[PDB]
Amino acid sequence: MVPISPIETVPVKLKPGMDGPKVKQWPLTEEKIKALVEICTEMEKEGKISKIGPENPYNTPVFAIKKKDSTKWRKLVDFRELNKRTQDFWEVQLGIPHPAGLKKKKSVTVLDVGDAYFSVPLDEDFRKYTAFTIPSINNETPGIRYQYNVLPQGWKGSPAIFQSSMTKILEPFAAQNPDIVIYQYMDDLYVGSDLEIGQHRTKIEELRQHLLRWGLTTPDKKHQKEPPFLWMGYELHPDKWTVQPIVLPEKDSWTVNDIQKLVGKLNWASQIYPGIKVRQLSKLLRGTKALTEVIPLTEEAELELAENREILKEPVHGVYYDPSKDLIAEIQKQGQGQWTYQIYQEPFKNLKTGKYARMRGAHTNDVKQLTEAVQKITTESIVIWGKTPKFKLPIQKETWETWWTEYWQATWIPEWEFVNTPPLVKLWYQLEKEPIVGAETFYVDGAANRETKLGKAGYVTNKGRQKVVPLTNTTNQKTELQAIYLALQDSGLEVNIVTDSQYALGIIQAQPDKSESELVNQIIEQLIKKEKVYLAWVPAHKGIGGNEQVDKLVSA
């Protein structure tokens, strides 16, 4: 006997105040019982389970399933009840690696660890909770009772405990072999390196020897598995990666569910295929939720779809990360709140692509959206590469400076350079900081009756220009905007506007270039045509001249 190091057990507890499962065992056919007896007999021989006495109060149901078409039975224990009662664990495999963060490898070998998979010992004190019963033939004898000595398949703590145990075993090998990488997925280990094939092969044997110290055998028969690997929806190749094939279906009629599937594929595709757009297609999914309901595709959605098909016509691949080179991120505006980006090191070879969509809200502008896209790409890049890319942005340096210096919020974007690739992000208007000499002064107001919803909006000016418009189906807030709109509409290229509306100031000081409000949009259109606009606020009902007059007129 060659002594092996034991694997230390992780201490496990039930959730506070909870006891173990007591669940009735289903009756089974005579054939299932016999097959389970045989399976458990074998498992018992290997030390995976042990027979127990009647004293253990616990039970979990056991099943037997024949695969599809076949004569072979396998044992399935239904752990649902025990899982509800088992403590939460630290889960490591959250946050899977992104292929674009991986490094190219000359060789990647797969090692079958299935032996270890079913061999990790279970905490001695927790074993009683895993009890199960094979029903007896005809129910004329007590059922055969067993509990697990090892991590059971399907138990809540099995994946975390297996991963942590394997990791601890592998740690010294990884540390003392900085020239390889090791990754564990299911019952396999993947070992890559850049070593010349002889040295690589030697590292693999050494790893097999290292694992032997815990008694973990790997088959002499070497893995049929070779690159490319199909993993987590990706194809990984030694020098490149892509997403697994994406084929958009041909359809005469589109179901809600069909459209959800389409968007899913497109979203998945967008991390490599540059320029993917989901806006119009996603719109069709609003409200509803009835899965089998068919929707007509709008002309816009048809167009988006056709554009996507073109983008998807042939395979595209990403390259891997070279830590010795800068990361560059370039962003383009696509229209309708849509933004697309590429991240690369060398020109024309992307590591990855992606998209950003405008956040929901009443009012917005391109600069805010661009800023949000930058922050998102920044955060994604920290995750994947541990660093911020240098940005190439379709906005002039002077535009950005004018923006951030005058914007009411603190705002910043990291190191970036202008790339001239229309459409450019620009400021459509900027209001004056001081009142304009020589420019006509419009005092605006509006009011509405909450009940009848009748209202008025208008202005009076220092030149004695005046307007009042009667309005139906309106609110006080709408009349306040309407009044500003009228002053813009009726003034020359330079204008001073005086309003008491805190609501309107709040919106305009947010500097929107687009709005869900038709009225805000009309105001923006008017601002764009002006040379100079000064907007001044005053408190209502203070006896402020020209403000009180117009207030009088618009009230009743």
Partner 1 sequence: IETVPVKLKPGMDGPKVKQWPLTEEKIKALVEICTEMEKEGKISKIGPENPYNTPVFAIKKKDSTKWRKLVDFRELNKRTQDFWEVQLGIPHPAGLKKKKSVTVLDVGDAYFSVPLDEDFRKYTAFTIPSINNETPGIRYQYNVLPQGWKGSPAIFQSSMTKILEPFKKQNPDIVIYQYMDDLYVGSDLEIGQHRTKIEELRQHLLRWGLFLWMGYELHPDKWTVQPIVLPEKDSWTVNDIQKLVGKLNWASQIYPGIKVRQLSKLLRGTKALTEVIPLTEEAELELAENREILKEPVHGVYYDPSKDLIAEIQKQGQGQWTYQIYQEPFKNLKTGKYARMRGAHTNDVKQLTEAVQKITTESIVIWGKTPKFKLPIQKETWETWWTEYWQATWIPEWEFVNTPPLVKLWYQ
Ligand X SMILES: Cc1cc(/C=C/C#N)cc(C)c1Nc1ccnc(Nc2ccc(C#N)cc2)n1
Ligand Y SMILES: NCC(=O)Nc1ccc2[nH]c(=O)[nH]c2c1
249/464 with CB nearer partner 1: 464
Angstrom distance (rounded) from CA 260 to CA 278: 11
181/544 with CB nearer ligand X: 181
- When binding is defined by CB under 5 A, the residue of 235, 304, 480, 551 that contacts Mg ion is 551
283/426 with CB nearer ligand Y: 426
Contact 281, 300 (CB under 8 A): no
Number of residues counted as binding ligand Y (CB under 6 A): 8
**Binding-site partner at residue 274 among ligand Y, ligand X, Mg ion, none, CB < 5 to 8 Å by type:** none
Residue with tokens 């696509």: 334
Q: Which residues contact 543 (CB under 8 A, 6 or more apart)?
A: none
- List binders of partner 1 among 487-516 (CB under 8 A): 496, 498, 502, 505-506, 509-510
Q: Which residues contact 502 (CB under 8 A, 6 or more apart)?
A: 537
174 binding ligand X? (CB under 6 A): no
366/551 with CB nearer Mg ion: 551
323 binding ligand X? (CB under 6 A): no
- List binders of ligand Y among 421-440 (CB under 6 A): 427, 429-430, 432
Contact 15, 85 (CB under 8 A): yes
136 binding ligand Y? (CB under 6 A): no
183/428 with CB nearer ligand Y: 428
Q: Which residues contact 470 (CB under 8 A, 6 or more apart)?
A: 454, 455, 456
The token duo for 490 is 């009726």
Residue of this chain nearest to Mg ion (CB atom):
551
Contact 147, 130 (CB under 8 A): yes
- Only segment of 246-254, 267-275, 373-381, 396-404 that touches ligand Y (CB under 6 A): 396-404
Contact 394, 425 (CB under 8 A): yes
**188 a known binding residue?**
yes
The token duo for 396 is 């002039």
136/430 with CB nearer ligand Y: 430
- When binding is defined by CB under 6 A, the residue of 43, 64, 100, 108 that contacts ligand X is 108
- To ligand X, the closest distance from the beta carbon of 228 in angstroms equals 6
Strands 188-193 and 107-112: antiparallel
Angstrom distance (rounded) from CA 107 to CA 158: 31
- Only segment of 112-120, 271-279, 464-472, 543-551 that touches Mg ion (CB under 5 A): 543-551
402/549 with CB nearer ligand Y: 402
Contact 338, 304 (CB under 8 A): no
Cα–Cα separations (whole angstroms), residue 480 to 251, 462, 510, 520: 49, 20, 17, 11
Angstrom distance (rounded) from CA 478 to CA 484: 10
- When binding is defined by CB under 8 A, the residue of 396, 399, 475, 549 that contacts partner 1 is 549
402 binding ligand Y? (CB under 6 A): yes
Output phi, psi for 254, to 5 deg: -110, 120
204 binding ligand X? (CB under 6 A): no
235 binding Mg ion? (CB under 5 A): no
Return the biggest CA–CA distance within the chain: 108
Residue positions forming the annotated binding site for Mg(2+): 112, 187-188, 445, 480, 500, 551
Q: Which residues bind ligand X (CB under 6 A)?
A: 97, 102-105, 108, 181, 183, 185, 190, 192, 227, 229, 231, 236-238
